[PDB]
Amino acid sequence: LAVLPKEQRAEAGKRVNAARNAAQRSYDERLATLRAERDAAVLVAEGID
Amino acid sequence: FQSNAMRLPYSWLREVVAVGASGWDVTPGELEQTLLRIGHEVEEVIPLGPVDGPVTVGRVADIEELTGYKKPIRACAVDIGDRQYREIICGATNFAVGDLVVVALPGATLPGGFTISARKAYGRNSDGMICSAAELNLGADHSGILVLPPGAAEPGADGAGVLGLDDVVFHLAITPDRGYCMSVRGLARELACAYDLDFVDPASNSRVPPLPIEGPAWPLTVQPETGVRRFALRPVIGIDPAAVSPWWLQRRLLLCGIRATCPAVDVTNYVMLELGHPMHAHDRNRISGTLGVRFARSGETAVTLDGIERKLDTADVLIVDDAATAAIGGVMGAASTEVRADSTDVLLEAAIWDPAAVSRTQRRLHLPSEAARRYERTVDPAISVAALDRCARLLADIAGGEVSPTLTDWRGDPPCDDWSPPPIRMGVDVPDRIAGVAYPQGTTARRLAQIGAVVTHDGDTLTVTPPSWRPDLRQPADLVEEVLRLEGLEVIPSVLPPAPAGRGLTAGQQRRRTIGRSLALSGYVEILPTPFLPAGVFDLWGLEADDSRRMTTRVLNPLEADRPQLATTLLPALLEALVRNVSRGLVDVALFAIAQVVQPTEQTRGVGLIPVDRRPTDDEIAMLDASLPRQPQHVAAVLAGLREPRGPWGPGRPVEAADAFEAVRIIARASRVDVTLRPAQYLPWHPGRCAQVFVGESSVGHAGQLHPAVIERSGLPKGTCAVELNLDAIPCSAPLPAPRVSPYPAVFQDVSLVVAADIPAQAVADAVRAGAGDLLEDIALFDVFTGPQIGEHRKSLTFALRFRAPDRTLTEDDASAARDAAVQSAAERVGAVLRG
Amino acid sequence: PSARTRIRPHFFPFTEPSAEVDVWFANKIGGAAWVEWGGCGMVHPNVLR
RNA sequence: GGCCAGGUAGCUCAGUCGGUAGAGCGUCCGCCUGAAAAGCGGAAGGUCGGCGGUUCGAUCCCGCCCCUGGCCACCA
Ligand SMILES: [Cl-]
Ligand SMILES: [Mg+2]
Ligand SMILES: [Mg+2]
Ligand SMILES: [Mg+2]
Ligand SMILES: [Mg+2]
Ligand SMILES: [Mg+2]
């Protein structure tokens, strides 16, 4: 976006911001889901004596 | 803008001491030791100067400003005496042509080391510099050069002589019980005491009679309950606004940390420094109607004479007139009546405000003025008119005008006429007894009269009436301190007391040492843990909202605004310390702490003030203790990285949960109690590697590996393990064993039992002990096996058994019977199946 | 037995007479000097009461 | 509570006044070694102290706040 001319950046940045947020949002939920599974696996794992 | 301690030049002090004791003179070094000896902390001894060579008075004859540079730059010709002129480039801006200034010419040496040679600057030559008070080591320069008042000296006069540079400035930190020592008056009196000198009090009717009192001056009303003790007013009419203070006055104000402004204000500060009674000057033409002293109303404001608005509260005492606030009483005057350039008629104010009221007000408003810090330590009410008269005469002397023969002197309702505190009765030998020194006969009466008290002597009792400037003298112990400090503490001998036979350390105290020793021997390093929890730690742990650890005592004003909660558990602080050490290169770490925690309850709240003139009753004592949060001693430990370092013997052993269980057993052995460990779920521990620790059937804590999410969210190392026990819930114990050593041989057998995988190994061993009875001398697990021969969710345990009789050799069949009874006990209590 | 101490009159609300004890601290930052060690005195009669 | 300077990676610090932000040491991998380290080669790791606002987009601009170091000040 820094190489773009000054008046072409506004419209390009919108697309870039929306595309990056879409992928960032998908990462957050997957991180969460995999964290929840890790903690639920901790609960049912057999303990040590 | 405001200074701090008691500064005064030696010459002034000497002058006042010398009136009574002609020619008294001591070195600064001796004076320092004498002051320390009698109880005045000497923070600094500042010899003025020194200067060498041509540092002389000069007069600015011509100024030429120099444009093109960052600041205004003046090219001045200065008359340096004997009709000679020097060009000098100077930076400052607080002088005009005609001013007497102090020049340091080529060949001079300034404190300290700055050799003055003719230098160039801004395309012009400079035969020296015009000095500031700082550059001369005279005072604080106030970002400007020093102008001497007209007539102070001639151009060419020797600067060191004119400036009195052979003086020495003492900076003392006066203790708050000695308000009378915030002046030359009190300090001179203390020295006359310490040197046994005849003393002339500078605040008495002395050398000139008091001023006449032919009628009332300005009218005054004082609101009841304001704590004003005295309020005197006397005007000086028709002073010369163009007058300035003479050099001797300006210098003394400068040496004492006070910047000189104009004669009316300079005189109030000078007399305040000399006598200890703060004085205020009002422009008399700017007062509207009756002067009133009253409390401030809620939300009221006042503009002090620095142009700053102050939010007032209702405990602040004001001086007002009909139109505006004249002063925040005893703290700072208001702009409305302040003396200024044009003022010709001055109304001088000598008042005594309530010490506590001034203390509250000045500290809340952050105005520790020269007046305020004197009134909060109390001011001698007997000298208000004496200081008033001294002030008025001095001001008429400097600036002209007439001292009016009128005086308003309000001395309370009803008028108080004797300002001495109540008399104190004390045995004549009481100082001797407290000191453990037999003082020469008559020492106590001599010393107490020296400090100004009236002493009457009947039998072996003194009746001692303190002087009005000593309101700190209220009981015999106060008087004892006076005698002892003047005689000097060095005469008191050093004698160890006879202690009765003590009982030494308590059991709890001994046990804390033993636990400490043992953990340190096992590789743990002690930290002393902060009681302020990390921000949101229990959220990072994921604790339930009703977890008791979240019920914390809170600090109103903590070190870190985000850490006001006091710790209910030591683990947060230990874990923070763990991260700290690991972050600095020491990845293999074991830390412990032994410290109290803070656990409030329902009854954790305030208890109102109880009068301190009696013992609190046993019910009040118990209510005070019951109102505090519970504060039990805990012991805790954390470990991460390698538990055992690598070496020639192989690569070393990573920390594991079993190391945390061993730390529990180290603590229990040190405490000489038995513990049992049971599986538990309890954040922040891993629910499958967590033990709850029991003594008897009382829970005392938890141990094991921390939960992986807690580790991830707190930035802790993988595998961190931890222990925390409540020491106060571990009972003391005094085991008295009486072993009997059987001379007969023992029998060794082993036994393999299969149990469900969730049965703890220790519950099997206990069942084996239970069934086997008295022949069983020892049992030790040595094998846990879960291979393919063992069903799923089951495990095979094998124990080494040692049997021995106290009175016979056993047969193999005798042990086998005991083993078979153990096997049956294990089937009955834990479902064990004899391995086949 | 060789360390340098000194006792001098001072003040505390709960003692009378009061004193402060300094020790000669050779390694003080900026040069050796007396440094406050602690406070002391005879227990104030208001405290006993 | 006053003033000055700061807050950037695991540690010690540069740097950017709107779209790429780093170094030295610390961590990880390959070659190498029996295993290491060095050397060569190559990676990971930062919400640029917090929260708002402006903006398509803020470590950087605006506002409010918190904290660190130093120098004052205060005091049991
Ligand atoms: Cl089986
Ligand atoms: Mg006293
Ligand atoms: Mg056998
Ligand atoms: Mg003190
Ligand atoms: Mg850092
Ligand atoms: Mg927007």
**Letter for the amino acid at B744?**
Y
From the number of C-beta atoms within 10 Å of its C-beta (0-12, 13-18, 19+), residue B198 rates as exposed
3-class DSSP assignment, residue B235: strand
Residue contact C44–B477, C-beta within 8 A:
yes
Contact between B8 and B170 (Cβ < 8 Å): yes
Pairing of strands B589-596, B525-526: parallel
Element (H, E) at B448: helix B443-450
Closest Cα partner for B264 from B247, B287, B288, B241? B241
Which candidate, B657, B614, B664, places its Cα nearest to that of B635?
B664
Beta bridge partners of B458: B461
3-class DSSP string for B187-224: HHHHHHHHCCCCCCCCCCCCCCCCCCCCECCCCEEECC
**Hey, how many other C-beta atoms are within 10 angstroms of the C-beta on B169?**
23
Partner-chain contact B679 A39, CB within 8 Å: no
Q: What technique was this entry resolved by?
A: X-ray
**Chain C residues with CB-CB distance to B179 below 8 A:** none
Question: Considering only residues 105 to 164 of chain B, which have any Cβ-Cβ distance to chain A shorter than 8 Å?
Answer: none
The subunits that touch chain B, with at least 3 C-beta pairs less than 8 Å apart, are A, C
CB B802 within 8 A of CB B777: yes
As a whole number of angstroms, the distance between CA B34 and CA B40 comes to 9
CATH architecture label of B220-410: 3-Layer(bba) Sandwich (3.50)
**Positions of strand D less than 7 angstroms from a protein CB:** 1, 10-11, 19-20, 26, 56-57, 65-68, 72-76
Cα C16 to ligand 2 centroid, rounded to whole Å: 6
Centroid of chain to Cα A48? 35
Task: Dig out the tokens for B373 from the structure.
Answer: 């810090």
| B424-491 is a CATH 3.30.56.10 domain | yes
Distance from C-alpha of B312 to C-alpha of B320, rounded to nearest angstrom: 14
B437 three-class SS = coil
CA of B527 to C1' of D69 (A): 24
Do the beta carbons of residue B283 and residue B333 sit within 8 Å?
Answer: no
Which residues, in sequence order, are CB contacts of B19 under 8 Å at separation 6+? Answer: B200, B202
Residue B259 in contact with residue B251, Cβ under 8 Å? Answer: no
Enclosing H/E stretch for B525: strand B525-526
CB B643 within 8 A of CB B590: yes
Does A28 contact B at CB distance below 8 Å? no
Chain B CB within 8 Å of residue C14 CB: no
CA distances from B3 to B6, B171, B173, B181, B729 (A): 9, 11, 12, 17, 54
Nearest-angstrom CA–CA distance, B781 and B771: 16
> Which helix H or strand E contains B121, and what residues bound it?
strand B119-121
The answer to whether the CB atoms of A48 and B688 lie below 8 A apart is: yes
Is residue B707 within 8 Å of residue B685, measured between CB atoms? yes
Residues 6+ apart with CB under 8 A from C43: C14, C15
Short-list B387, B322, B380, B377, CA closest to B349 = B387
Neighbouring C-beta atoms of residue B197, cutoff 10 Å:
17
Distance from CA of B493 to the nearest CA of C (A): 12
Ligand 3 centroid from CA B113, angstroms: 97
- Residue of chain C whose alpha carbon sits nearest to that of B43: C34
Start-to-end CA span in chain A (Å): 59
Q: List CB contacts of C33: < 8 A, sequence separation 6 or more.
A: C24, C25
Give the orientation angle of helix B263-275 with respect to helix B384-399, to 10 degrees: 140
With a CB cutoff of 8 Å and minimum separation 6, the contacts of B167 are: B9, B10, B11, B47, B48, B255
Q: What is the DSSP letter of B630?
A: B
SS (H, E, C) B283-319: EHHHCCCCEEEEECCCCCEEEECCCCEEECCCCCEEE
B602 is in an annotated binding site: no
Gap positions in chain B, given as the residue before each gap (C–N > 2.5 A)? none
Q: Between the CA of residue A33 and those of A39, B122, B337, B711, B713, what are the distances in Å? A: 10, 73, 74, 18, 16
Whether residue B414 is preceded by a cis peptide bond, meaning omega within 30 degrees of 0, is yes
CATH topology for the B55-168 domain: OB fold (Dihydrolipoamide Acetyltransferase, E2P) (2.40.50)
Exposed, middle or buried by CB within 10 Å (0-12, 13-18, 19+), for B190? buried
Residues of A in contact with B707 (CB under 8 A): 39, 42
Both tokens assigned to B262: 């104009």
Chain B closest-CA separation from residue C18 CA (Å): 8
Flag whether C20 is marked binding.
no
User: How many other C-beta atoms are found inside a 10 Å radius of the C-beta of residue B168?
Assistant: 17
Domain B747-834 falls in which CATH fold? Alpha-Beta Plaits (3.30.70)
CA dist., res. B465 & res. B420, Å (int): 7
Which stretches of B459-570 are DSSP H helices?
476-487, 507-521, 537-541
Alpha-carbon separation of residue B59 from B56, B152, B588 (angstroms): 10, 11, 75
DSSP 8-state class, residue B461:
E
Class of domain B507-729: alpha beta
Q: Name chain A's partners: 3 or more CB pairs within 8 A.
A: B
Q: By the CB < 8 Å criterion, does C11 face chain B?
A: yes
- Full DSSP string of B72-103: -EEEEEEE-STT-EEEEEE---S--TT-EEEE
**Taking the C-alpha atoms of A16, A22, A23 and A24 in order, what is their torsion angle to the nearest 10 degrees?**
100
Would the CB atoms of A38 and B708 count as touching at under 8 Å?
yes
Do B281 and B263 touch, CB atoms closer than 8 A?
no
Q: Would you list the domain boundaries of chain B?
A: 55-168, 220-410, 424-491, 507-729, 747-834
Q: Give the tokens for residue B703.
A: 């141990």
- Which tokens is B818 given? 């005991």
The DSSP annotation for B685-737 comes to EEEEEEEEEEETTEEEEEEEEEPHHHHHHHTPPTT-EEEEEEGGGS-------
Resolution limit, Å: 2.2
